[model samples]
Target: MLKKKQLTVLDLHPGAGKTRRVLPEIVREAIKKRLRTVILAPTRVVAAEMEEALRGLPVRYMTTAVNVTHSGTEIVDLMCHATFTSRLLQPIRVPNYNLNIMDEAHFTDPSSIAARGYISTRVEMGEAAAIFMTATPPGTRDAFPDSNSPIMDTEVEVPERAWSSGFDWVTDHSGKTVWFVPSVRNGNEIAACLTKAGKRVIQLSRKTFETEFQKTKNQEWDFVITTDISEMGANFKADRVIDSRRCLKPVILDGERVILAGPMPVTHASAAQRRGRIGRNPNKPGDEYMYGGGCAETDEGHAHWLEARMLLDNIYLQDGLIASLYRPEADKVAAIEGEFKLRTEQRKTFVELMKRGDLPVWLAYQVASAGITYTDRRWCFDGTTNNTIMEDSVPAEVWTKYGEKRVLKPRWMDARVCSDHAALKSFKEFAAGKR
Candidate 1:
């Protein structure tokens, strides 16, 4: 009767044995029922972490490293793969797993291919149950629509202290540390400075990030310079973590563009994640660093830094972070609803065309997104070359058939080839047609 639920949402605290202890028991229970299970993770690193965590359980499990199911294994208990890989496996004929488990499920983008594919595959196979585990659920009205209730909910307790002067707080930590920066360039600069000051440092970039994480997994490091890579699922046992805070990007709210004041201003979710990295070692005292002094060199800098401080203070103390910064415009509700309908129509048309073999799945998705009509003049079939072209530059034919099987270009194609604001015109036409 418990398995009858479609989705289970679990908001477990970090370092509280969510993945390490609870997941294996769930897998064992699923295997006891002889149900094939699939676990999806957000990143390769997190997927690998889940795989490592699952090894403690005595079960026949397969991972996506081979790009295919194991040849000799007839009855596999569980399978693990990255979320994007799940999307790629969608179109292919594969084993129908009964249970689907999404690790760090909150990180699954609602609008991404993985999210759509996950929903599609689960429905196609009639999955018995799906479980979602995450530390930080998205900060929205209804983050997970499918999940009815949370089975487990716990918050990890961590004592946090903030410093306002500078990186002076970091210098006090003689043990292992992690400096969270804004960008790769900033990380490199900090790493260089730390190295010059006689500190053993390792700078983590996109390419070497995973390897570095693996290398530093077991041992304590003097310092690890990185970006938000360590914010979520990845765990680092650091005595202290110094954060170089600044507004890295801009946000649009109610037709006004505004720059946020903190390291991650749009959502305090990131700041919480960053704070969680340290303070894991309960025995040792942990400290976090930021820059918000009374005097600033420039007026704009002062305003930005003050905003950043207010944002973080409200996030930690007041509990009203998002409401203070952003509010959605009610006037845009109709337009937003219209776009949602257009997207629904796009997906509907894509599925219809895909069933008829009129277009490849990816191309169909593109066509749907571009809002290309089935009988549009932009589609062309070349009798001479025996190929389809969506470009207008292709030679026009006197007796060419247009419709299914003809390549269709979304009016809002990539900017490189899009001519004379075609996307804008296409959007207007779509709105008018809807009216």
Candidate 2:
């Protein structure tokens, strides 16, 4: 009898406090597996953050080194083309390495010209193992050939997806008025309101962060209205958002009554995190108001189910044979084929849940279907475009089968890169809306 292959398990560690320290575990796991993982993250900032954590690990420069090749950040002066870094070091001597880590696995959706370079590199090097990590990993269906498929074969088992314990909550909004300013004009109006209230408003300015924000701490103001930058890197203790936003950008507010107004980014996970920021503090209750995009304005988004479809082929190959027989009835949630439907009744129920407001329904759904769950969330007629949803997030072929498609799905399809509208608008609004 063939013995079962022993598997390696990745522990996220006790508490999620290891956010800044996760890189070491990543490298450690890669070396143990002799993998050449091409780590991908949604943004350069995230990639840099990951690198910061692994900066001083004991990996050798050749066999166990990290090569972050994002345009300006290329290591060893290696021109990162075909998207993969050739083991051949030009000025510096190096050996062929065997691990690839793709940080933002979701961004690979369109197969951008730049991204194609990375994919080609992986194929050329015959890089066997890959790990794609994201706060939002693409659904089982959307997993890719190089990253998703092999990882599935390795079948790394993880725990149920739940909340990270380290979140702060809000308490009061009594005299504090939340500004739902959708435009620059609205921003000024909100400032006017706060000023007239006889409140000692300490509004934040663009120059506010001229120095480090943490250095500017003082406990003397009645009301502080600044920019979202005030909220990003440093610890922000605001109880309400007073959103001068017409729409939501996908960031969370984690206190008892953190008010969030505005449209969120296009992805499923982005919106979820925004609501998550509220209700995180054990001492307080979380609250938020998300406004924007009616049904007509809500355009549909897409997911790539290529990796999931590929697995089906493997499943078929092993169909009747005892050893090959692997049934995944558990992960199979909804078997959707066309016009992704969220029936009006369901939509009403969703709206009702939003109105009643205990837990955000969409966020709850997202939590339930996480990739790390014992059985990934599967539900019929998945909603629009979230890489994080298990059922809706299938492979490219599955998308095609549903008569659903991404332009890049076609071999002859020309690749077009477009900025994330939700990302652009949401972030831009938050920036300009700052006092």
Candidate 3:
């Protein structure tokens, strides 16, 4: 018998724009039953971009409520104005939700006050249908009982080596030499050393964050050093992506090659998501890099460094994850149902985790919508394969039980992996991958 309220995290892999594949499936099968849906992104910049793409998908009978709640942008006009406490004390008036998407599902944590408030408000409103989406969903260890919440689909994670081919080729061409720095202080010091060596060494700083970075919008920077700010609020066309610490993937896309030079904090899921940026277009070539940085110091600054490396390494070895993102060698691809199966699986994992017990309860729901799962919920994976089988078989109970905006108790067995279904060929004909 199919387990009640169980879905795995692997189903929600966010690589290669896979989330787009799964979302429509949710709307067709799950959202149509609910009538309202909310979509979110990791960063405000990405949230706007994702909503536009989602609008273009094949969805019917639903009105979307994209959270434009960022303090920095004009998106705030769309969201209901209420603080976390206010919403918790009294439910805000929100549109009925046949579906709600919490983008960047990992950030729904206690550390974030905004996430807590948003989640509480959603729960108060009782969002009926919901989907949480993120490439790297947080683990049980980090979030405790909150990690294993149930989901409808849980087979979205793409493989590590799937991204390997793109980055491996980049290293061969770039003669890769990356410095994994622990903090802003170390990044500054390493910049000086690399330049002294007369390497094409690009070192980014606050200046790059301001002017040099902005200039790249209309242009692409080949051998450039930039901070996370460059990766934020805009898109830069580049032949290669050499990610420095602050250059999180939620803010950037479309690079031929991606390299990671530092460790990710234990609390962070950026490393796994970073590798997904490559191998998106079959007509194009790309690769991902994880330069092993270890023996990190911590007392004052280094403790988090080692924790971060663990975050990056976990990306490489996560199971059922490596194969979902396999490139099929097609020069160009079209949207297919198989891809949707992959994406919806991923969303289920992330959304369920947000509801699990012991989470911020209030903020986890909000952050999942506004920040975490919203990051890269939509992207065309491989861009080389098209196998639209339209597997709109996701159960309705998932949305009803684990739907958006509800705080769930994370029972240890919830969201258990359903690999047999996701990897089996009996289901392949429905999606028609690679041929």
Candidate 4:
């Protein structure tokens, strides 16, 4: 394929051999042709696997040993995403790699790291072979319009996805399970507890990361705790995945990035990556779960969980709107119109539950950016803010209800106080000319 086309793209699902089957052949061909090659992986863990698969190839990644191992026919540089980005900013000319490849190409911000520039430069430099590869590729369509794309296989497993309390997951699940723990500290603590409990467990962090992963490749363990460093690739098909991290990205609230620690939501991409870890056996599949543990419904953590869902719903609406403009295959504006009605009704239910003083004022401030507001009082969608929600608030109203027959008046509420559902309902009904 590369003999004819200077640039090409290969798209395949997680277990479908983009790394295991396809990459080796390309590396060998580069050797056969005496072409200098550079393979970029999203993480050091992934690049380590690639190095082993490619037979002890030296990885020029962060803090790892670097050897001058090039001898004529053998010239390949394996780099992680961080290394790739760092090297791109070098004052020196682009590395003289004749064969360039990017694994998990979705990690490339088509706009940043001069990703476009690198792709075009290598391909245009006198027919250097270039392949931009990923399992998730649709988002990158705008960037690689000129490259030839071919799908070798499509066997993405739908895992039994589920959530658990951050710490309780260590003991709850049966069989071989993989835990995407929040930090290396968590990895050590969890593994230590399990190790003391006479369980076969490991923490793939820091010094033990590379060796433990290679050892566990064919070995069995009760659970393997890890951080986001291992999120991108490499397959560890577990019965269930304990995704304990929210994986939330910081957002610009006032002027700078706001980093909130509690029940805030996560992005779609990170959640999908976590889901991909399980259900990969393809022969048998199970139900999926999400993370978070709190009291039944009125608890603070539980409320943040609900509010997080509300925030993600708002993101879906924004995503749908943007998709409509760029995505021609999307159905006709009819999709959003229907979604808006259903989502509004769902919002009414969520707002009713918000009366327990569980909602966060900062969250409503962030939600307002989505052009919707869910404060202590009534929510709004017509680009206007009501008295119920605001930013950085203190000691808002909290409601206690016995009977719905008799209620209060001028009910503009706070995070602790949920607005009267009937009042908000009446307001929307009147706007819809229902009553």
Candidate 5:
């Protein structure tokens, strides 16, 4: 029996071991009450960390896999965890779980596919204790509706070795550093600069950053230079972090592509998200510095500087940085939505189908947006059977909940029977209201 309809938020510095320390107690309590538990992470890296942290506990834990088939005994004996990047947990009957734990709840944009699917799960699994874990909880009431006041929020313990300036600190620290730049070109240049200065450095980009970060999570390096990809959710702690862009550029929700413009203005909330990443580890307290002047600071520098100073003084001004950064994209996304208004209406039909129990809500909402229609609400547009869907295509995992679903392979059964052309024609005709 759960207490109430409230999801407690646990706020802690990036490496502060808050989740590691608090998660077990939550699980232990849930287990003692014989409640099922589920922990969802934003990235595989974070999901892996959650699993590692729970390993020491006595409770039997299992992770979501490409295949979720298990014996009834196995299902009864395990607490489950999975990543939003994959559909390994798609078949889960959420009503079976009594406690739902979201690891990185800050990224829970209501429009996002992960959040939407999780919402479906939560609706079905009503009354389960939901715990949101993140360093940066949502600032807006719309992001979280249950409790405006967090159950637990922590403050970073200032380290005696913290630094105030960028160059002076990196010049002194010998342990490790992570320099965040605005572009791949800048990452490469910064990497070269550090290497020339006799530092072992590796630069990461959107392509190979996740893999490299996973590979090096436990290893030590002199410097890790990365594009904005490492700014959020990719946990990398260093003796010091030199951030080049005060305001991060806006990115497309669908393609996850960075929109290059004059550095877009950022809010204090955005900077605070980045700042929470440093000095995370209590054992290894770190320093942070902002590096931007001249052209870099002229456009968006002052805003970034204000955010930085506020954070330094322990003053967080709740602002809608994400909304502002993405405001420029409203016209573009709206145009696309208007162009495909027919498909959008079709998506509502799928939701209706989900309500009717003709199909799983997650798959219905996901595939409908991709311009893929359901066959009697049972199979994908390309005739991929539900039983074989998870086994055959990566599409089950990579597609976003928000974008126009790009149908790479309509039918995964036979590559020779290419359906992309027909799929495109169908979509175009639908846009034109042709049969």
Candidate 6:
């Protein structure tokens, strides 16, 4: 039923109505068409949240809690990413599902042998329609294969907005606050200090995170302090959120383990993810919109930018050592040095595009990703919202296939909107050239 074997990215930031609103809408439409659907989450904690979003729907929901709440062949099946990858390895009994929604897709491990083969089966072989929804999308093919290897891809993107509450509420009143720390040692020390100051503080680490987190559901506390383990979809039910992720990290030096207090480079999305612990699109007490810089000029420039970004992302995913302490790490280091040379070359090409900047690199990337889909696919609407555009200037076939008379609101940027994309040929030529 899919006109396109498309992989779409919903680049909506936290509290931008992603899981709370958009997901259920997509599922409902799929059900109407009798599309077999599979919704996957990064963790069981996140999977439970989806179950709540789709409470009344006939879904087979499974997690670490139980063997799945339903038994019949439900139209929708929601499970964690591990379960999806593990169970999908076995061929029999598993239906060729049509629709796939990967929530918090940034947390995926596509480089794993099983993960790579599993996703290739479900997506590449089955031709299943996929939507990777996340506030922070991974920048690499290794972390997210769909970013690169997909035959066609598109996305619905929104801007980044920072929220400011009335005042420093956490400092003045400690009524149910979720404090996120960088390391377990720092979290424990902070909780101990707070407790000695006549405060009720609970420290949660990987050792007893689940049991302690469940206990906080009923027990009253000033605040709960934990490490990055709580960064995903679990709700702390806290009115205030304190994100103190900047702290010391452990490093092995000369023959001893030591904690180094270096300025850690923060990832792009943690600040938004941490604040979202409160809620989404909350009361606009005070806010600021952060916009990106100018983009590369040509489509080739956009591809170069994406390639460099993905290359760096994979380089970051490389292990500090191969472990076992047996093999020579120098060989891996030399291989990485080769990639560094390529990255430098790519950066030079990107700078040349910037010299003639006309668009944001983010927008250009979106254009590159969506242009292929819009050219070949049926507007590829996950079709539940009014986020559409009505342009009558494109080729008549665009209007014929997209809408009867007018163009649908361009959820993903269409090249025809700006320039004369009448020359925008089908990707077959481009794909063939690449091949």
Runs in model 4 lying further than 4 Å from the true structure: 1-7, 31-35, 56-68, 72-75, 108-117, 120-129, 138-172, 181-221, 252-268, 282-435
Give the alpha carbon lDDT tens digit for every residue of 1-435 in model 1: 116336666666545566778887887787688776666655567656766777645444354532333445333344433333333323444455567666665442221223423333354344456666666554523211221112211222211222234545454567777766655555666677666667778766444567777767665568888766566477765655555432243222332123323333323334445545655544554344332211111122222222222212211111221111111111211222122222445545654443332332333444555676544434322222432223357622222232234333332222211112332233223322311
Give the candidate number with the greatest TM-score: 1
In candidate 1, the residue pairs with backbone N, CA or C atoms under 3 Å apart (3 or more residues apart, or in different chains) clash, namely none
lDDT of 6 by residue, 297-363 (tens): 1111122222223223222112421111002111211122223222333433332222222222232
Model 5 TM-score (2 dp): 0.53
Rank list by TM-score: 1, 5, 6, 4, 3, 2
Residue 313 lDDT, candidate 1, scale 0-100: 21
lDDT of 5 by residue, 1-435 (tens): 244444566766444455678876777777677666666655555555666666644433344421243444321223322222122223323343566666655542222223323333343334446666666553421211222122112222211122334545454667666666655555666677666667777777645655678545666678787755464467664555555433333332232112234444233334444444455555553354443422221223222222112111111112211111122112222222122122335545544433332322323344455555543322223443431222134433212223344333332232111222332333323322222
Model 2 accuracy (lDDT, Cα):
0.29
* TM-score of candidate 4 on Cα atoms, chains taken together: 0.48
Check candidate 6 and list the clashing pairs: 295-359, 295-361, 388-409, 389-408, 389-409, 389-410
Estimate, for each residue in 280-310, the C-alpha lDDT of model 4 and write its tens digit: 5555556233443211111122222222223
Candidates' lDDT values, in order? 0.44, 0.29, 0.30, 0.46, 0.42, 0.46
Candidates in order, TM-scores: namely: 0.54, 0.34, 0.38, 0.48, 0.53, 0.51
Worst 10 residues of 2 by lDDT: 410-419
Global local distance difference test of model 3 = 0.30
Candidate 1's C-alpha runs over 4 A off are 56-90, 94-96, 108-113, 120-127, 140-166, 218-220, 245-266, 285-435
Instruction: Name the better of 2 and 5 by TM-score.
Output: 5
